[PDB]
């Protein structure tokens, strides 16, 4: 299968410096570019940039020019994206992409910058402590930064009643949001709930059991 | 440097219904149009390349056609897992540009929400700041008034949403309330409650602190 892995990104300080790294599997030929598109957070897509990495020939959007810069290394199968003088502006998910030399028919998964000065901070986390048959319980996961956090519940064997709000920005210009999952009310106490909250930009993880209060 | 100017910028539709999504190109642009859905904060998907051919594994009810400058995507009869961003973009060159995005909503029956409340947990409390959660579950539709009130007094200011999106099979959003106080504060109080009001029903849950 064809496969596009993005990896760099996170967060840097505005007039700072980033490269992408976008890793190419599967591809039965080099008769294709290589794309980056970014969406800034409740905005549209925006292409970037494009190479033919098989013979250096780039492409640039106004709003990046002479600022960003797309390579190829066709040795390591990896497109880059050099990316200078960060604005705020620049926060987004930014996306690798291919298309024949068609559409965008593969893309990577996608890769968080976040241009600001503000601290990484790891989240507290805090239970949701839990009428009919139905009972609801959950993680509030409070005042991280930057973006983002997952969560699971019970290692990934609970997944059916899930729901994982978007976060919100404090006024206090941290990250929160919960986590929660409805279960049988007789299932309390016989089953042990546990929400596993990630923030890999603090290298942070945090097991939480959620027991009745 | 070319515009791609998208009709309608959201829409709702019952399943079954027909969708048609319209695209048009502020110059020629052959037929060097390509459609694409996205699921929030998900990679978007390849639906249609050059206006009209479907790509590998997408379900026969997309269609795409063009019209010298404009260019539509139909969905003959949408479901409920077809809710999403759909954008159409051109690639005459390469300068690509992009359409604003047409965020499909699927159309449902009413659905009263599940209501629950969660005090602060005493962790918090010894950091100085409560925080006082109220869920929404698996409701429709999306519009629906939640109000805090403590010891029966109507708050306002120290309270933020947050919003699922659409459940992929049931078509139905969930939110969470959250109210902020201090410590202080919320030792002073014993009621605190949350309010649901959708049409005519009005839900409120609550705690009394400390029981
Ligand atoms: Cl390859
Ligand atoms: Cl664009
Ligand atoms: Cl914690
Ligand atoms: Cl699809
Ligand atoms: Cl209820
Ligand atoms: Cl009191």
């Known amino acids: 299968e064809v496969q596009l892995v993005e990896s760099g990104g996170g967060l840097v300080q505005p007039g700072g410096s980033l490269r992408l790294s976008c890793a190419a599997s599967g591809f039965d030929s080099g008769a294709y570019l290589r794309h980056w598109v970014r969406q800034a957070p409740g905005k549209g897509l925006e292409w970037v940039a494009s190479?033919?990495?098989?013979?250096?020939?780039?492409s640039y959007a106004d709003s990046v020019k002479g600022r960003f810069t797309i390579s190829a290394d066709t040795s390591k199968n990896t497109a880059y994206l050099q990316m200078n003088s960060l604005r705020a502006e620049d926060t987004a998910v930014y996306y690798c992409?291919?298309?024949?030399?068609?559409?965008?028919?593969?893309w990577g998964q996608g890769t968080l910058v976040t241009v600001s000065s503000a601290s990484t901070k790891g989240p507290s986390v805090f239970p949701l402590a839990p009428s009919g048959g139905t009972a609801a319980l959950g993680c509030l996961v409070k005042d991280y930064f930057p973006e983002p956090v997952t969560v699971s519940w019970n290692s990934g064997a609970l997944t059916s009643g899930v729901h994982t709000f978007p976060a919100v920005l404090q006024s206090s210009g941290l990250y929160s949001l919960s986590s929660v999952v409805t279960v049988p009310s007789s299932s309390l106490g016989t089953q042990t709930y546990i929400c596993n909250v990630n923030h890999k930009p603090s290298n942070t993880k945090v097991d939480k059991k959620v027991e009745p209060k | 440097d070319i515009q791609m100017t998208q009709s309608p910028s959201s829409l709702s539709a019952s399943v079954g219904d027909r969708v048609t999504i319209t695209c048009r190109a502020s110059?020629?642009?052959?037929?060097?149009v390509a459609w694409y859905q996205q699921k929030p904060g998900k990679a978007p998907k390849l639906l249609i390349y050059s206006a009209s051919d479907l790509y590998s594994g997408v379900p026969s009810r997309f269609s795409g056609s063009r019209s010298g400058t404009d260019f539509t995507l139909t969905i003959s009869s949408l479901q409920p897992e077809d809710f999403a961003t759909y954008y159409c973009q051109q690639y005459v060159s390469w300068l690509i540009t992009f359409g604003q995005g047409t965020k499909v909503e699927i159309k449902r029956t009413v659905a009263a929400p599940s209501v629950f409340i969660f005090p602060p947990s005493d962790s918090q409390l010894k950091s100085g700041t409560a925080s006082v959660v109220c869920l929404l579950n698996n409701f429709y539709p999306r519009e629906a008034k939640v109000q805090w009130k403590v010891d029966n007094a109507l708050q306002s200011g120290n309270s933020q949403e947050s919003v699922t999106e659409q459940d992929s099979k049931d078509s139905t959003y969930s939110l969470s309330s959250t109210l902020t106080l201090s410590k202080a504060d919320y030792e002073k109080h014993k009621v605190y409650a949350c309010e649901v009001t959708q049409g005519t029903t009005s839900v409120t849950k609550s705690f009394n602190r400390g029981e």
């Open positions: 110059q020629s642009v052959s037929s060097a």
């Open positions: 992409a291919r298309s024949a030399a068609p559409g965008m028919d593969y």
């Open positions: 190479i033919y990495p098989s013979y250096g020939y780039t």
